[PDB]
Design a protein around this ligand. Structure first.
Ligand SMILES: [Mg+2]
Ligand SMILES: [Mg+2]
Length: 97
RNA sequence: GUAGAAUAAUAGAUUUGAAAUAUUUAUUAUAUAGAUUUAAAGAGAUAAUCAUGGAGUAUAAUAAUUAAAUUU
C-alpha cells in the first residue's frame, strides 16, 4: 500500500455519541493549545480528520497561526518563494491528466 | 430610459452527506542518504537609439519675354 489511511488498513468505526462529540467541541474551543487534534484523537480513539470534522478551533487561534504562516513566508528568500510557486503549479498539473 | 424581468460573483440564511484510500489531502520545519540545479566581470548574433562619413539623389540665373494648355 502507498500513503494509505489507518482506517483503510483497519476499517472505519462509528462509536462516538452526541455527548462526547459535544464535549470534544467544548475542549477544542476552550484550550486549542492543550487539546490539539492529535490529543483529542488519541483520547477518543478517532482520527484527526474526524476531530477537525466535528470540532472547530477558536478564531484567535486560527488568526495567530495564520500570522505565523505569514511570518514564515516573509522570512523566505527569492529562490524559495519561486520554488514554492513552482511546487504549486506542478501539483496543479498532477490532476489535469 | 420617467421601469420591470432577464448572468456571475460577493457574502448571508436554512437545509445537506460523511468517523470521509488524512500512518500526508492542503502547507510546514529539522536531521540522515542520495541526485542535481542556478552565474554575466565581460562576449557573440540580431534589432533599435545616438553619432561619424558623404555614396546616392535633385538642381544649375528662376528673373523676364514669346507660344500651348486654366478659376472667375
Ligand atoms: Mg541569464
Ligand atoms: Mg549626418
Amino acid at each position: 500500500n502507498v500513503l494509505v489511511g489507518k482506517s483503510t488498513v483497519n476499517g472505519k468505526t462509528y462509536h462516538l455519541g452526541p455527548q462526547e462529540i459535544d464535549e470534544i467541541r467544548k475542549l477544542r474551543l476552550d484550550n486549542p493549545q492543550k487539546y490539539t487534534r492529535k490529543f483529542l484523537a488519541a483520547k477518543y480513539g478517532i482520527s484527526p480528520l474526524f476531530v477537525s470534522m466535528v470540532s472547530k478551533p477558536s478564531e484567535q487561534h486560527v488568526q495567530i497561526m495564520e500570522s505565523r504562516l505569514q511570518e514564515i513566508q516573509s522570512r523566505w528568500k527569492e529562490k524559495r518563494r519561486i520554488a514554492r510557486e513552482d511546487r504549486k503549479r506542478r501539483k496543479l498539473l498532477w490532476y489535469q491528466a
